[model samples]
Target: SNNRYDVTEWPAGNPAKDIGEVINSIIADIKARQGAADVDDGGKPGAVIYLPPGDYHLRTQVLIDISFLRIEGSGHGFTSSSIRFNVPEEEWPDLHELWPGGSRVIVDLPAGDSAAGAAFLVAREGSPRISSVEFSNFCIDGLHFTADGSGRHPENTYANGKTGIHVASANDSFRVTDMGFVYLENALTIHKADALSIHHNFIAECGSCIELRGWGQASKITDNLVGAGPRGHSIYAENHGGLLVTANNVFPRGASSVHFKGVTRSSVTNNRLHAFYPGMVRLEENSSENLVATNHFLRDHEPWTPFFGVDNGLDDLTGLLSISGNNNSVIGNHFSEVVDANEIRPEGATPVIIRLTAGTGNFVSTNHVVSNVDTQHVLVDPGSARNTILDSGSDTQVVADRAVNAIRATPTV
Candidate 1:
């Protein structure tokens, strides 16, 4: 069997009219022949749902329950394959209606009265663990959703522009690449998944671009362009290990470009940060053995009045690390055109390029600082202990405050 179902050929009216039913029919057909022969030579018993180059209107969430399924599209570039989801406002009332007995679906709504839903959900339900799934070369969109509610259902208020793709526990070996996301709470969210890869995608105007959490391991997120909106961050990961984040361009809006909390043995390297509010990258909560290297951090000086006891206009800014951060390596980063407006310019004052406020056993080495501000290039605060700051390249300046005795070592000459 060819085992490929194209949405354009399903009872053609609007091309997307019967997409929901057509997809479900395909899933059911595959589920019936669970252990059948391979669709391709020497491959697993899988089916490919090919989405041609057009606009697909998704009325409900598309659930992937079984294993060996691949969702492919024509292309993710200009005038390519796209999926626009408009989930209903009312709750499904029963869980089975949303997901049958053998599948899992996580809506990811906050505790109190925050209405939300997902455009696509991949869950591992009762049995036959869903594995080896791939979503590639397409766009999952949520632009038509409204804040108040979809006008069609005045009483049902569940559509709060939730996530574009929500992959929860019990799934493994999942990959999503070469995609685009717009107008979503979170473009891609994975929890407790293993061996996942998310890269080469465009995410914009969403609550958060990507969130990876739980016990997911060996995950790689790279080579993507992320534009953060008001309540969004380029990337957010927590309590995970063996992750790689690199080679991406981030435009920060309200928060840092990338944030890692309680993550271990991870590397965030070789990315370009266009702008940051307070700092570019933040690693906190005992995040250890992590390498933050060879990245560029540039922030255009903005003139905003002093607000809430901090001067925004002044160049008393922080470059990379934050407080309560420890056991990390920040090296070979270039800071350019960082200026300070305030004249105080104390010995250990604001615009401290690399602020390691209160961390121990951290290393800041060979970083190039090109700023005219009369600020400490590296501030190892009084509370921090046993950290090292090494200078190099002659042109790169490494200035440290004497108030802290943490520097037991110095940069090479």
Candidate 2:
């Protein structure tokens, strides 16, 4: 146990104080060891804060100021204990069950003090030089909402403004994998991250699932089943570059599945994207040079029928692709607007399927847009100049002459 430290071994200070204080105390000890003056590598020898299989509550956040640390747990708690707002409380088997415990960290901040947002904060002020920090096999619970409200919206509880693991400093090789986060405002918020890899995590029932914020580089969010509320994004990124968003199941509850603003040279490929609303994949704010290929965008009539007055207008369910960026490729995708034949009024949908309204030098080719919704109009509409539309074979209309100076296909070897 030279470099490994278990959280249970630390002395939890007071019986009444928050358990997060105990975790914070251990982190402070690790930080002191990392800064010890007498020995090489600060005499810390690279520590591991092991939180064994149990429930750890937090009224205060756990702060990690040192680098080269590994925080591991016994399990990732794939069996979540999130809020089941739609189900009646009497119907649940166990009414007093808080969570399926496995190194679970619950955010229990007072309602009056909701400003301290993050549960685990990775931050330091000196030179922004943190590196090689990893968090794996744990569960973070926002414990703000009980499973009592019937048909309640997740936004109503506000999740006590909790974020699961917030990387608040510039770091290299920061990784979060095999973790579960539920009932959070934002699961992972990365700021100034480089070479960040977030994969194999089950993060759903949250406000915003994963947000790559404030300029990062070479980050990849892959192979996760993530969802957010109707007012949030499942995977949102801004001001970043060289990002890869691949092989993830983006659920249908979000307002938008993948949103990019001012992000360039990124690729979002090979994902099953479901939608409760229109505009599943939005590339805006000069988000150029991105490749969105080989994805399946699907929307069933069931997820759409709930939003009756909200998405009543035709413009709401029109185009799935709201592309306002330049030089991006939408290729080899299949957009399915399926109808439930047994349900009445299933075909009230009119889909535009895809539209490039405000960008130049874009490409849309070989995508399959099929709708059982009676009238499918304007399958691929390119309204920007100097853009190329390779004509997806499964749509009603692919207008080549709508945009002025639309480039014709000239194949070159």
Off by over 4 Å in 1: 11-15, 35-44, 77-116, 126-129, 144-160, 301-319, 337-349, 392-413
- The lDDT of each candidate is 0.62, 0.72
Worst 10 residues of 2 by lDDT: 305-314
For model 1, the run of ten residues with the poorest summed lDDT: 99-108
What is the overall TM-score of model 1 with all chains considered together? Answer: 0.75
What TM-score, to 2 decimals, does candidate 2 have? 0.85
Clashing pairs in 1: 315-340, 316-350, 316-351, 317-351, 390-411, 391-411
What TM-score, over all chains together, does every model reach? 0.75, 0.85
Question: What is the Cα-based lDDT of residue 102 in candidate 1?
Answer: 10
lDDT of 2 by residue, 275-299 (tens): 7567788888999999999999886
